[PDB]
């Protein structure tokens, strides 16, 4: 008992001081972002690892080092057209300012007449999504290894007044050591107080988002619950062929658990997936600590997860640099840069 | 079972976010 009360009552002082120093580092790069730290022709383009609304992420090779990265290429023109300037600007501004062991590191970013570019660390493990579906589901200890990384990641982002808004296996890359690197900060926003945009993945949307209520940090804790349920079950708690059926399941107030879920899991999950904001874990007087101290996390050495001293229960096949076996195949499109600058004013700060 | 209902649905693929 008493050794864990000196350990617990001291871990917390280290954490209060870690976070303060993290808020300073973040604020420095947030009030003064790095711009134009590379150029397109410095990388060879090999293969598409993924796509989104305005372009794609590609495996690329930096010719001076031969280091492989993942480059996100967005077409400025489609961004303007879809009225997402602000969201694309938040994404880069936030990635370039953040810093944590489970956040994808942004190395360089730049722009040319046509496109925006973000060059990030390559995670050759591919997305959690891909191994979750292949295998069916993860065991609770396997799910918990991942969940703990998400819990601390949000503790970080929320301390920075950030909200992530797109938790789901698709956005959780697996690195060479089997740990998580969260990507796709397209929906992230720095915010004190309330925000209103209806966005996110249907399955992971919190009720107060569906109901146009105006919402905060807490929608991320709802999402953590959806993630832990999907990881542990092989399917999400709310699904259906049409989104409008998903939304009504989410607001009904009601969830069913597989017979294989432990009681501790079910109880952690009943408190994350709580419609009543006064009752949802992550959102009470004690905050994240209600989740950390929950019985399901009894085996979790929170400090050892931060320091990556715990064994990943799943280290992927690593067939050397520049290999993409852990990724799906996509149609390739040639990158075309124009001789005319598009949307210069709209993207000045990028 | 709930797992067969899921596998037979159209939400087992890579999922896109919305923007209302
Ligand atoms: C938030 C949405 C998605 C809502 C719908 C409208 N567009 C929005 C939106 C907002 C910001 C954006 O930057 C974009 C994009 O255009 C965009 C463009 C490309 C990608 C993309 O390829 N990301 C891949 C694949 C999708 C799933 N997440 C994994 C991601 N891959 C990686 O990030 C990766 C990192 C490291 N090593 C390998 C891979 C994602 C988003 C974007 F589409």
Question: Are A13-32+127-317 and A33-126+318-348 equal in CATH topology?
Answer: no
How remote is the CA of residue A44 from the centroid of ligand 1, in Å?
A: 20
Given the structure tokens 């874990």, which residue do they identify? A281
* Residue of A43, A50, A75 to mutate, ligand 1, most atoms within 8 A of C-beta: A50
**How far apart (Å, rounded) are the C-alpha atoms in residues A27 and A219?**
24
Q: Do B14 and A129 touch (CB under 8 A)?
A: yes
Pick the CATH number of A33-126+318-348 from 3.30.200.20, 2.170.120.40, 3.55.40.20, 3.40.50.880: 3.30.200.20
Q: What are the distances in angstroms from CA A305 to CA A20, A173, A178, A221, B11?
A: 20, 16, 12, 19, 32
State the DSSP code for A313. Answer: S
**How far apart (Å, rounded) are the C-alpha atoms in residues A166 and A200?**
5
For residue A68, list its beta bridge partners: A61
Given the structure tokens 């008493």, which residue do they identify? A2
Resolution (A): 2.5
Helices (H), chain A: 2-30, 76-81, 85-97, 128-135, 140-159, 207-210, 218-233, 243-251, 263-272, 289-292, 302-306
How remote is the CA of residue A52 from the centroid of ligand 1, in Å?
A: 5
State the DSSP code for A296. Answer: G
Please list, in sequence order, all residues whose beta carbon lies within 8 angstroms of the beta carbon of residue A104, skipping any fewer than 6 positions away.
A95, A120, A121, A123, A173, A181, A182, A183
Residue of B nearest to A84 (CA): B19
Architecture of domain A13-32+127-317: Orthogonal Bundle (1.10)
Task: Give yes or no for residue A55 CB within 6 A of ligand 1.
Answer: yes
User: Distance of alpha carbon A175 from its chain centroid, rounded?
Assistant: 14
Given the structure tokens 């077409």, which residue do they identify? A75
Cβ atoms A294, A272 nearer than 8 A: no
Task: Give yes or no for residue A117 CB within 6 A of ligand 1.
Answer: no
Task: Give yes or no for residue A209 CB within 6 A of ligand 1.
Answer: no
* Residue of A119, A169, A181, A186 to mutate, ligand 1, most atoms within 8 A of C-beta: A186
Cβ atoms A308, A177 nearer than 8 A: yes
**How far apart (Å, rounded) are the C-alpha atoms in residues A263 and B2?**
19
Residue ranges per domain, chain A? 13-32+127-317, 33-126+318-348
Q: Which of A100, A37, A202, A183 is nearest to B11 (CA)?
A: A202
Cβ atoms A335, A73 nearer than 8 A: yes
**How far apart (Å, rounded) are the C-alpha atoms in residues A85 and A68?**
28
């Amino acid at each position: 008992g008493n050794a864990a009360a000196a350990k617990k009552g001291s871990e917390q002082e280290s954490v209060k001081e870690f976070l303060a120093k993290a808020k300073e580092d973040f604020l420095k790069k947030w009030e003064n972002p790095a711009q134009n730290t590379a150029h397109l022709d410095q990388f060879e383009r090999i293969k598409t690892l993924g796509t989104g609304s305005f372009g794609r992420v590609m495996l690329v090779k930096h010719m001076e080092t031969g280091n492989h990265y993942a480059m996100k290429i967005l077409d400025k023109q489609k961004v303007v057209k879809l009225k997402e300037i602000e969201h694309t600007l938040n994404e880069k501004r936030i990635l370039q300012a953040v810093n944590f062991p489970f956040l994808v590191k942004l190395e360089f970013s730049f722009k040319d007449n046509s496109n925006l570019y973000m060059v990030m660390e390559y995670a050759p493990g591919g997305e959690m999504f891909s191994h979750l579906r292949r295998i069916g589901r993860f065991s609770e200890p396997h799910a918990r290894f991942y969940a703990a990384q998400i819990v601390l990641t949000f503790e970080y982002l929320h301390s920075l007044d950030l909200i992530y808004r797109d938790l789901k296996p698709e956005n959780l890359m697996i690195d060479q050591q089997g740990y998580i690197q969260v990507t796709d900060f397209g929906l992230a926003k720095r915010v004190k107080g309330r925000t209103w945009t209806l966005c996110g993945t249907p399955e992971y949307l919190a009720p107060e988002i569906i109901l146009s209520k105006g919402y905060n940090k807490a929608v991320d804790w709802w999402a953590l619950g959806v993630l832990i349920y999907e990881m542990a079950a092989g399917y999400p708690p709310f699904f259906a062929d049409q989104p409008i059926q998903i939304y009504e399941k989410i607001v009904s107030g009601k969830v069913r658990f597989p017979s294989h879920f432990s009681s501790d899991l079910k109880d952690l999950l009943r408190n994350l997936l709580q419609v009543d904001l006064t009752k949802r874990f992550g959102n009470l007087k004690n905050g994240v600590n209600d989740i950390k101290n929950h019985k399901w996390f009894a085996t979790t050495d929170w400090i050892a997860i931060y320091q990556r001293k715990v064994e990943a229960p799943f280290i992927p096949k690593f067939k050397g640099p520049g290999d993409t076996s852990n990724f799906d195949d996509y149609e390739e499109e040639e990158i075309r840069v124009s001789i005319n600058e598009k949307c210069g004013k709209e993207f000045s700060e990028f | 079972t709930t797992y067969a209902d899921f596998i037979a649905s159209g939400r087992t693929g890579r999922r896109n976010a919305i923007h209302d």
